[PDB]
């Protein structure tokens, strides 16, 4: 009755709290590991903590295909969190593999692919869309039930920072304000994203669906995210807007990402039922909100 | 309530010295560099010491003063590197200008730069702490179990062999293997203690004093299995550097220590890890 679900990428930023968030869960938790984590110290000492909690640890590699269906036919489900920062412009693409090695091991109820973030397929008028579009569509014509998770903004990458470029922490004087500050975002602390992802991965409505992750009092403008930031500080910063017109499209070193979520506002350009979003599938999740997530910073 | 700035808390060791301070009870503080702002994990890691009770401090080591203003706001300085050695002695001229600092304990937590590229490194260090007049701790003579314990001392990995293990020798030289845990554990007790200003304190916690051998049987024990040995004269030895010195010189326990100078025994309550219990992880 415990679901075994194989995090695949759980050493990295979001990949770390999907295992931890499947651990809290109850389910049975399976790390892949590969071989050349064995010089890394702190993979390893990453890894061999997950087992301390009860995780397990497969080995195998995305190079030799029999080690990663020997791999994915212990587990009932696959979780793959393969972008940002330990990773490269198309790890998401290795997905391919995986989806190769799921379909002939035939065991696997559910495969949620590296998807948290904004929607692609939202994103035909704008690649990270046509990759993570490519491992959709290998998922599905191969018949792997999936769920999408989606939706989010990564609260350390744009809430932490007052949604400024350049920095992972809120501005001393200055702030950066895109158009008006007022097109809606959906900023959300990843743990919620992993505890939101390690409630849907066996939740059987949401089986071949895509899961919205909008946690309703954290829907906000960036003026208002510097409105909580303002008010904790007591301090009012100076704010430079910026128009829509000012465009790096050109080449200057950036990404034009942030143009999607703060001027098209895709984040919140279509509403959401309540059996497609994860705060009301998911009541009991607590999540936070940006006026105590950014007290940390103060 | 000693305060300790932790120089370095980033670093696999620095941060275990941070936890090990806040642990204590030390006012812990850790600095964060202007380059620090881009990193996600080193941001993770520096407010994660913050939701423990630490405080950072923004400087820099290319800016005198921040790190004179920094080393002015806590009694005692911890520096681990681990990110270069020598930056230390701009540290050291900060805590001469500063002149608060009760002790300094200089990045040294390996093997003892007096038996001795890094320990022309650390020995200058040294000599720049005892002309500035700044009263020391030197913290050494240790294996860290997860570069020399965990893979059984082999080369190439961090994990057990396994079925085929190289043995160094007779592997009857005796080595000194500490849990780096229990290394930042004794460093916290040590920081602030009288006994131990201006001294030299030795990690050696008795029952870790082992040969490869022994240390093979205690995984061949907690396992059932044995392992093929291999055994690898010095000769055969050929391309750390340090492997060399530990295993076939014994340099980690040529001089036996006094109980006033080894951390076991100067704090007996750290039930330091035995490596019969530090190997269980890995089955």
Redesign the interface.
């Known amino acids: 009755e415990k679901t075994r679900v194989l995090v695949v990428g759980g050493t990295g930023?979001m990949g770390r709290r999907i295992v931890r968030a499947c651990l809290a869960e109850g389910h049975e938790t399976y790390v892949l590991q590969q071989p050349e984590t064995?010089?890394?110290?702190?993979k390893?000492?990453l890894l061999?903590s997950y087992?301390?909690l009860g995780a397990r640890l497969i080995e195998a590699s995305f190079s030799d295909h029999q080690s990663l269906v020997s791999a994915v036919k212990q587990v009932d489900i696959v979780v793959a969190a393969m972008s940002?920062?330990h990773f490269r412009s198309h790890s998401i693409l290795v997905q391919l593999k995986l989806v190769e090695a799921i379909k002939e091991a035939g065991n696997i109820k559910r495969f949620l692919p590296s998807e948290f973030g904004m929607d692609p397929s939202r994103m035909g008028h704008a690649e990270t869309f046509d990759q993570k579009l490519e491992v959709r569509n290998a998922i599905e014509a191969a018949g792997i039930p999936h769920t999408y998770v989606v939706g989010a903004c990564f609260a350390?990458?744009f809430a932490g920072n007052l949604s400024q470029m350049?920095?992972?922490?809120p501005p001393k004087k200055k702030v950066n304000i895109y158009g008006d500050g007022n097109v809606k975002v959906v900023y959300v602390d990843e743990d919620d994203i992993a505890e939101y992802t390690a409630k849907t991965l066996d939740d059987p409505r949401t089986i071949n669906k895509t899961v919205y992750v909008r946690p309703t009092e954290n829907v906000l403008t960036q003026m208002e995210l510097v409105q909580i930031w303002e008010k904790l500080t007591g301090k009012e910063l100076e704010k430079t807007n910026i128009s829509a017109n000012d465009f790096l499209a050109d080449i200057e070193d950036k990404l034009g990402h942030f143009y999607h979520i703060f001027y098209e506002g895709c984040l919140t350009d279509h509403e959401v039922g309540d059996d497609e979003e994860a705060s009301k599938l998911y009541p009991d999740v607590k999540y936070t909100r940006m006026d105590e997530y950014l007290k940390?910073?103060l």
């Open positions: 930023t064995r010089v890394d110290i702190e390893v000492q061999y087992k301390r940002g920062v350390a990458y350049g920095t992972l922490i940390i910073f």
